[PDB]
Every structure is written in C-alpha cells, then in structure tokens.
C-alpha cells in the first residue's frame, strides 16, 4: 500500500506503474488537459476527449518560468476526499522538480475542474542544451492519492527538439 511519503523522496523514475487501473475505485477520469504559459497566455498543449503520454515541445518551452495546467475530470459515485497529485520530473534520472498539488472539493458523479500552477526550476544553459539534445530522457511520474492511498499512476516523457 503506497502513500505520499513513499514517493516524495524518489530520486529516479519508477521502472513500472506502482498501481493497476483497477485501484482507481473512485473512477477518476481526466477528460481535458490544457497547459498555458502564464506570462503570454499562449496555449502550449491541449487535449479533449492514457497512462502514458509523450510530449513534443520546442526549445522555447525550457525558457518558461510559470505554466498553468487546467484539468477536467469526472468522478464516480463514491466520495473523493483529499485528492492529491505528486508529480516528479527527472532528466536522465536526476530530479528536476517535484510538484505537490491538493485538489479542491470533488463533487461525486460529476465533472470537476482544477488549475495547477507549475513554477519552473532554474535550468542551467548546459542542462537546457542537454535536454534539447536528448529527447524522451526527460520523464515524469504522476502519482495520484485519495486519503493518502495511491489510486492512479501516470507516466510521461518529453522532447524539446521540434
């Protein structure tokens, strides 16, 4: 049984998913995801209607300071309390940054909306160059908890070449 404290100290991407789809007993289902630059309002990525997503971004992405993510999700009939996401980004298994977001109150049996603010870590010129040169070696784990219990785990990797 996996809790926040089990992921909050991880120094590498996991080799596998830490939970199965079945453990999502609350039937949480993301139906919209949109990321924008908070300094320009430019929409960097959007999808409407999936445990793994591969992102193709540009070099300029790595110069962003603050991005806003908007997420829409439905929930099943069981109450969802203390819905929390811990998302850890790594380059070649060096931690870049971990983000810890607590969702607001989730209405059962309905569509919910949330905005998460990511403040980018400072990236050295060397690191930016390497990240551009090494697509898909930037990787993230997204751990989702309800009442301190892991119920979803999504993965992603990132290119900054295109």
Author numbering: 59 to 107, 126 to 238
Paper text:
UNC119 is a myristoyl binding protein that plays a significant role in maintaining myristoylated proteins in the primary cilium through cycles of solubilising myristoylated proteins and release at the primary cilia by the release factor ARL3GTP, which is specifically activated by ARL13B in the primary cilium. Interestingly, T cells lack primary cilium, but recently, it was reported, in Jurkat cells, that UNC119 plays an important role in shuttling LCK to the plasma membrane and specifically to the IS with UNC119 being proposed to activate RAB11 to traffic LCK-containing endosomes to the IS. LCK undergoes co- and post-translational modifications including N-myristoylation and palmitoylation, which are essential for the localisation of LCK on plasma membranes and RAB11-positive endosomes. Here, we demonstrate a direct role of the ciliary protein UNC119 in trafficking LCK to the immunological synapse.
We sought to confirm the mechanism of action of UNC119i by successfully determining the cocrystal structure of UNC119 with UNC119i to 2.21 Å resolution. The structure confirmed the binding mode of squarunkin A (blue) and its mode of action, which is indeed a direct competitor for the UNC119 myristoyl binding pocket (grey surface). Thus, Unc119i provides a means to competitively inhibit LCK binding to Unc119 and could be used to determine whether the steady-state distribution of LCK in CD8+ T cells relies on Unc119 function. Before sparse matrix screening, the protein was incubated with a twofold molar excess of squarunkin. (A) Structure of UNC119 inhibitor, Squarunkin A. Crystals were obtained in the JBS Kinase screen in a condition containing 30% wt/vol PEG3350, 100 mM Sodium acetate, pH 4.6, and 200 mM ammonium acetate. N-myristoylated LCK peptide is shown in purple stick representation and UNC119i in yellow stick representation. Cross section of UNC119 is shown in green in cartoon and surface form. Critically, this work also highlights that despite squarunkin A only binding to the lipid binding cleft in UNC119, this was sufficient to prevent LCK localisation. This, and previously published work in Jurkat cells, suggests that the major mechanism by which UNC119 acts is by solubilising LCK and trafficking it to the IS as opposed to through activating RAB11-dependent endosomal traffic.
